[PDB]
Amino acid sequence: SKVTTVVATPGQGPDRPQEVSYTDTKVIGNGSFGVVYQAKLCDSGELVAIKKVLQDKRFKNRELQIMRKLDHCNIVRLRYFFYSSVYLNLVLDYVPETVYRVARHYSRAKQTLPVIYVKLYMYQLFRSLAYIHSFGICHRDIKPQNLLLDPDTAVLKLCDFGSAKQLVRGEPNVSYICSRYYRAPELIFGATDYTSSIDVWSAGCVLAELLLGQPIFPGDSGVDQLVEIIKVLGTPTREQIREMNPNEFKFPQIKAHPWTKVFRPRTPPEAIALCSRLLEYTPTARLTPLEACAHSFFDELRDPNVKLPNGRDTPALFNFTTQELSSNPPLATILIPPHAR
Ligand SMILES: COc1ccc(-n2cnc3ccc(-c4n[nH]c(=S)o4)cc32)cc1
C-alpha cells in the first residue's frame, strides 16, 4: 500500500509545516461534501480521516478558518491540513460510525435506540453546539449523518463544518440551508437573518428522530416541509411569523398536536419535555445548547454510578471549559456534578 508523504500544517500550532506520512488510504465517503478518506499515520499507528474539499487557488476557505479555531472533545479535531490536486485536505480524528447508520440499523431491525444512548449522544451534540455557539458559529447542517460515534466508548464527535459560518449580527445569510428534514421553519420562510438557534431546531429534529425511529418532519420537497411541521406544531401564528421572518406563502389554520401524542406511548417525559423546548416555531424560545444540557433529560448522565451497557465508564462529560460555561455561567451546580469537580 502506497505510503504517501505530504507537507502539512498542524491545526493548533503556528503555521509550521511538517512531513506527515500516511498509508492504508481508502475512500470511505464521496459526495456533496467532497471526498472523505481513511488513513493510518505511519509512525503513530493512529487512524485518521481526510476530507478532500474543493478549493480554487485563491479563494479563502471558511471551513478551515473555523476548523483551527476549535478544540472540543465532542468535535472532530483538525490534526493537520494540506494541499493537493487546488484542493484543501483536512486530516481529522477518525471516528468509526455515524448516528445516521446507527439509527438506521435500529430502524431496520424494528428496534428503538436505547434511551440512554439517546441521552449520551444528544448530550455531546448539545455540548458541542454550546461550544461553537459561544463563538457565534452556526453549524447549519446538524443532521444524523453529521454526528459521528465511537460505539464502544459512546463518544459523539460533531463533524462536517462545510456550511458553518461565523454569523454576523446585522448581516444576511442564505435561507436555503441545512438538510430538508432538519431545516428550521424560519429557514423555510426564507429568513435571511437567523440566529445560531436553527442548530438547536436541527438538534431537536435529531433527538425526535432517535425517539421515533424515523424523521419527525419528513417532507418530500422544500415547500412540503412546512406541511410536515404543521401536522405536529400547528399553524404558526402570524405573530410567530413576525418572530421568524418579517416580510410569501398562503396557509389555513391547522390545529396543534399535543406532545405526548407524537411519541410512541413509553417515551420518557423528560425526553418529550425537551423537544417541546427545542421544536419551537420561535427561535428565541428554543433553549440555548448550554441550557439544553442542564435539562432533566441528561440527569441519568449526572449520576456518579452511571455506566455504559458494556460495564464501562462514560466518556468525558464534565470537562467544561469556562469558555464553554459562558452563555450562562451560573449553571455549573446543575452541569458539573459533585464528583468531577
Ligand atoms: C460511510 O460512513 C462514514 C464515513 C466517514 C467517517 N469518518 C470517520 N472519521 C471521520 C472524521 C471526519 C469525517 C468528516 N468530517 N466532515 C466530513 S464531510 O467528514 C468523517 C469521518 C465515518 C463514517
Ligand SMILES: Cc1cccc(C#N)c1
Ligand atoms: C458529511 C459526512 C458525514 C459523515 C461521513 C461522511 C463521509 N464520508 C460525510
